[PDB]
Design an enzyme around this catalytic site. Structure first.
Site, PDB file in Angstrom:
ATOM      1  CD  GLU A 210      -3.197  -1.045   0.434  1.00  9.48           C
ATOM      2  OE1 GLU A 210      -3.294  -0.152  -0.440  1.00  9.48           O
ATOM      3  OE2 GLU A 210      -4.094  -1.892   0.648  1.00  9.48           O
ATOM      4  N   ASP A 219      -6.497   6.685  -4.801  1.00  8.86           N
ATOM      5  CA  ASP A 219      -6.203   5.247  -4.769  1.00  8.86           C
ATOM      6  C   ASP A 219      -6.196   4.654  -6.183  1.00  8.86           C
TER       7      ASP A 219
END
Ligand SMILES: CC(C)CCC[C@@H](C)[C@H]1CC[C@H]2[C@@H]3CC=C4C[C@@H](O)CC[C@]4(C)[C@H]3CC[C@]12C
Ligand SMILES: CCCCCCCC/C=C\CCCCCCCC(=O)OC[C@H](O)CO
Ligand SMILES: CCCCCCCC/C=C\CCCCCCCC(=O)OC[C@H](O)CO
Ligand SMILES: CC(C)NC[C@H](O)COc1cccc2[nH]c3ccccc3c12
EC number: 3.2.1.17
Length: 440
Positions: A210, A219
């Site tokens: 991540e 994202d």
């Protein structure tokens, strides 16, 4: 015609070492983030390489192109003593980094050296003090000098600097100076790699997958995210993203958070991701059937997609329960998850297949630092070990490879003084330091 072309190769070898190792020392001597315990030992070997590139490699090149010694028998015994000290001090420094790295990786600090910057200097000073004694005293005392007439005819003559050794010195100074630290350095740095890969957890696994950004970013799916994959909201309003952040932290963030703030959020998202499994009756029995490594691989999927999303893999979770990893792997890869994030799904499914951190091998920023120190140590061996093997072999039998090979393998070892500055280009901290000094 050979000599002119040979000189230009060596002239560039010299300058490549000098300017290379200058730039390395200059960067640590000026840049704040580069002043570390591990980079202090790096300064000690870049120093040995610079002394090599200034007092050894230039005099060594002359002794070859002119085929004779034109600097007297005093600078011959001093030149060899410096050379031996540089080679002894470099491997002992590398073995010190290897040991320091073993103690730093086993300690709860995981990637922090236990020695202070005061102890680190004493370790480098004791390296250079003791290695100068094992190099200059057995040479200036002439404990190295051989008994054969062929050697003494070179000892009396000022136009000779062929370093002739007796059978005892040649075996002792090779063992204490190079072989002893090499055996320890490799055995102990095989353990720094071993302890990093084994102590790899879910928090490092997700920091790999991540990443880390301390400001709100879009994202992979397109929703506002901060820290380590922490979804702030699916809303397309920055005012609706900066509202959820100010509430989740408990202060006026203004779209930016600290390393400590983000870590507090990430320890709360991982704990909820584990909770989300233990409350979901579909994932909970699979969480029981998975081992420690594969449990982190399921938490990795639930952290990304969510307890409901992962429960959707009705066939996969079933083949994961039945310990049929490869049968689950094919089903997990023919997913929309795999196609959205192929890089990460490649890593998550391999951890499910293998049940080892084989997918997250030298992925963490702190691990690429171990690989870098691992390449410097390994590349050194690639250059110096062929010289030392032939060095210790010709103590047993004199007549096989002679002078023509011994000098070449010595120059493979000499070229290693200029390779370490090019391997520091792997580290972003040095990459940034170099481009600043060179004005790029
Ligand atoms: C030619 C021979 C005889 C001279 C040897 C050179 C000496 C003076 C040099 C080479 C390597 C040097 C060390 C390299 C590493 C460091 C880190 C630095 O942050 C503080 C000083 C310290 C600890 C240096 C002290 C001086 C040192 C030992
Ligand atoms: C030749 C030896 C001189 C180099 C000294 C050096 O590397 O300085 C580092 C500085 O002390 C970092 O705190
Ligand atoms: C040029 C190639 C250098 C080889 C260095 C090496 O052997 O690598 C060590 C280790 O595998 C690093 O992860
Ligand atoms: C041209 C000569 C002066 N240089 C040889 C090597 O670079 C130095 O290698 C060594 C490093 C450390 C200890 C050593 N003992 C030796 C005995 C014989 C040859 C080299 C070494 C040697």
């Amino acid at each position: 015609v050979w000599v002119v072309g040979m000189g230009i190769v060596m002239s560039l070898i010299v300058l490549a070492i000098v300017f290379g190792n200058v730039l390395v020392i200059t960067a640590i001597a000026k840049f704040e983030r580069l002043q570390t315990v591990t980079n202090y030992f790096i300064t000690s070997l870049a120093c040995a390489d610079l002394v090599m590139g200034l007092a050894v490699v230039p005099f060594g090149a002359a002794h070859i192109l002119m085929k004779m010694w034109t600097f007297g028998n005093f600078w011959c015994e001093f030149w060899t003593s410096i050379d031996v000290l540089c080679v002894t001090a470099s491997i002992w420094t590398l073995c010190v980094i290897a040991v320091d790295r073993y103690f730093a990786i086993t300690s709860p600090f995981k990637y922090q050296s236990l020695l202070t910057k005061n102890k680190a200097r004493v370790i480098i000073l004791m390296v250079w003090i003791v290695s100068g004694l094992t190099s200059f005293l057995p040479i200036q005392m002439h404990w190295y000098r051989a008994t054969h007439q062929e050697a003494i005819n070179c000892y009396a003559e000022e136009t000779c600097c062929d370093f002739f050794t007796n059978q005892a010195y040649a075996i002792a100074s090779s063992i204490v100076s190079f072989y002893v630290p090499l055996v320890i350095m490799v055995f102990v740095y095989s353990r720094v790699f071993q302890e990093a890969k084994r102590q790899l957890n879910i928090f490092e696994m997700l920091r790999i997958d991540e990443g880390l950004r301390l400001k709100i970013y879009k994202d992979t799916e397109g929703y506002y995210t901060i820290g380590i994959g922490h979804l702030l909201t699916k809303s397309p309003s920055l005012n609706a993203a900066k509202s959820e952040l100010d509430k989740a932290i408990g202060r006026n963030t203004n779209g930016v958070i600290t390393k400590d703030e983000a870590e507090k959020l990430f320890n709360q998202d991982v704990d909820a991701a584990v909770r989300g499994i233990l409350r979901n009756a579909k994932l909970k029995p699979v969480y029981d059937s998975l081992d420690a490594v594969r449990r982190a691989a399921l938490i990795n999927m639930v952290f990304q997609m969510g307890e409901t999303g992962v429960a959707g893999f009705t066939n996969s979770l079933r083949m994961l329960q039945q310990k049929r990893w490869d049968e689950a792997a094919v089903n997990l890869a023919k997913s929309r998850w795999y196609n959205q994030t192929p890089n990460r799904a490649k890593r998550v499914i391999t951890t499910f297949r293998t049940g080892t951190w084989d997918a997250y091998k030298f992925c963490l920023k702190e691990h690429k630092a171990l690989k870098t120190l691992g390449i410097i140590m390994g590349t050194f061996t690639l250059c110096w070990l062929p010289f030392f093997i032939v060095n210790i072999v010709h103590v047993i039998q004199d007549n096989l490879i002679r002078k023509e090979v011994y000098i070449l393998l010595n120059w493979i070892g000499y070229v290693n003084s200029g390779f370490n500055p090019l391997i520091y280009c792997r580290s972003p901290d040095f990459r940034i330091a170099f481009q600043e000094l060179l004005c790029l």
